[PDB]
Amino acid sequence: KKILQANEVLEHLTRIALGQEKEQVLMGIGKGAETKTHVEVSAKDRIKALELLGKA
Amino acid sequence: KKILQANEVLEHLTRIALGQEKEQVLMGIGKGAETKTHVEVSAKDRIKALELLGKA
Amino acid sequence: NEKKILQANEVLEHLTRIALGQEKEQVLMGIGKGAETKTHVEVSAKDRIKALELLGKA
Amino acid sequence: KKILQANEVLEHLTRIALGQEKEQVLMGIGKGAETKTHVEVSAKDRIKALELLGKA
Amino acid sequence: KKILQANEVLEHLTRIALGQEKEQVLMGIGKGAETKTHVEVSAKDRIKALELLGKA
Amino acid sequence: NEKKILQANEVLEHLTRIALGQEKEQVLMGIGKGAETKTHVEVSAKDRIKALELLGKA
Amino acid sequence: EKKILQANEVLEHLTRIALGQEKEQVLMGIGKGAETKTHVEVSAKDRIKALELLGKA
Amino acid sequence: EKKILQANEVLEHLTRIALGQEKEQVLMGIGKGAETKTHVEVSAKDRIKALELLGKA
Amino acid sequence: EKKILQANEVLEHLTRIALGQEKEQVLMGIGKGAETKTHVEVSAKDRIKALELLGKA
Numbered sequence A, B, D, E: 001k002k003i004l005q006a007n008e009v010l011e012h013l014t015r016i017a018l019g020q021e022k023e024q025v026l027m028g029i030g031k032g033a034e035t036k037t038h039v040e041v042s043a044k045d046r047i048k049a050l051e052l053l054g055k056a
Numbered sequence C, F: 001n002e003k004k005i006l007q008a009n010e011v012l013e014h015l016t017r018i019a020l021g022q023e024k025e026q027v028l029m030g031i032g033k034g035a036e037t038k039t040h041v042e043v044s045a046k047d048r049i050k051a052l053e054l055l056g057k058a
Numbered sequence G, H, I: 001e002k003k004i005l006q007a008n009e010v011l012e013h014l015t016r017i018a019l020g021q022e023k024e025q026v027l028m029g030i031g032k033g034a035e036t037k038t039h040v041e042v043s044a045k046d047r048i049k050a051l052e053l054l055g056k057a
Helices: A004-017 A042-056 B006-017 B043-056 C009-017 C043-057 D006-017 D043-053 E006-017 E043-054 F006-020 F046-058 G008-016 G042-056 H006-021 H044-055 I007-016 I045-054
Strands: A022-030 A033-040 B020-028 B035-041 C024-030 C036-042 D022-030 D033-042 E022-030 E035-040 F025-030 F035-042 G023-031 G034-043 H024-030 H034-041 I023-031 I034-041
Touching: A004 A042, A004 B043, A022 B020, A022 B035, A033 I023, A042 B043, A042 I007, A042 I045, B006 C043, B006 I023, B020 C024, B020 C036, B035 C024, B035 I034, B043 C043, C009 C043, C009 D043, C024 D022, C024 D033, C024 E043, C036 D022, C043 D043, D006 E043, D022 E022, D022 E035, D043 E043, E006 E035, E006 E043, E006 F046, E022 F025, E022 I007, E043 F046, F006 G023, F006 G042, F025 F046, F025 G023, F025 G034, G008 G042, G008 H044, G023 H024, G042 H044, H006 H044, H006 I045, H024 I023, H024 I034, H044 I045, I007 I045
Parallel strands: none
Antiparallel strands: A022 A033, A022 I034, A033 B020, B020 B035, C024 C036, D022 D033, D033 E022, E022 E035, E035 F025, F025 F035, F035 G023, G023 G034, G034 H024, H024 H034, H034 I023, I023 I034
């Protein structure tokens, strides 16, 4: 049960901040039906990542 | 009786942060009907786990 | 029980059940045409991460 | 007029935390119509009750 | 005309926590139409009242 | 010209009106088929409790 | 260098908001999923924040 | 070479926002599930946030 | 072992955001519940968060 170390944490946040990452969400396909799909990680999230990298 | 220990907490946080995990959500299947489904844990929740991990 | 108070360890055991994915919550699910029904879902990733946080501060 | 004291506050939070409480919500009954009903208090709200009991 | 002092505040918060209060919300009545009505105060709000009472 | 600045007791008078359930806010309300109108409803519980909290702190 | 609001001008603005004077632009339904831009009174929540800022001043 | 917005510059921008000079792109309903991009004034909550930050300067 | 953004890199990225040079991907209604992916300007809320941080630096 490995544990992510502080520098591996800064790496993962860097990828997010650099627009490199995606998240799964629900997307309308029509008449109420939805499908799973991947979208870029949002501005809000990318900013939080940027905030943390700055506190490093 | 079980109380998750501090190291075990980091382990669990690590599995989330590394995109290994899912949550149960509702998804539309047509005309107002929904199904229970599993999706990846969001960027938002991953970044929080990542934040907690960098403060350890 | 009308004056039962959860003690510190009880709180941590309860958070541990949440954190470990052993708990549910009652939500409203759509069953067609605007109609909803009560159902139980796994506690969310967000709520589990709060429990984890809390267990990590202990 | 009554003022809840600390011990009563913790008793009330305890029932919440233990999943013994309900809240009134709006539930869809068809074609935009809704009705009042009671649901279990949410995980979020329970978890806040625990955090508060953890701090006493 | 009036300013609430701290003990009056607690009195009002107590009513809320004890579940003696309501709030006005919009409820659907069908075909997009909504109607004003009252519901019990939510658990989130009741918990906040509790939190303040226990910190008094 | 000197513009108005709410003074200490005036803020408390306003929060008190809110807390007491004397005030309203403007919101959009469905009237049929996706169309909405503007109306007033009572300030909500969350907002009243925030007013109360600020009153307690003063 | 441009225009920067001073500490007083901030309070003046906040007071107009707290006093129910201001509005904000929102989207309103006009039917069948279609919406239009309209203005509405600044909300209770936003007025309470303003009151707060004025209270801490 | 690359730009870093300095403290004074930030206050100028926040001031434009607090005054009601700025807008944001949002999705608006146009009927039957269709939305379109359009601009609206920056909301009250966001303006009050700019006001808070300027107030603390 | 892998790339980590340094402080000035962070400020540069935040500056792009505050300045309204950046977008985000979202889902938009195209009809009858159908959605498609598309890019929108970064919202005011987020631009003000970037502004705040820059002010802090």
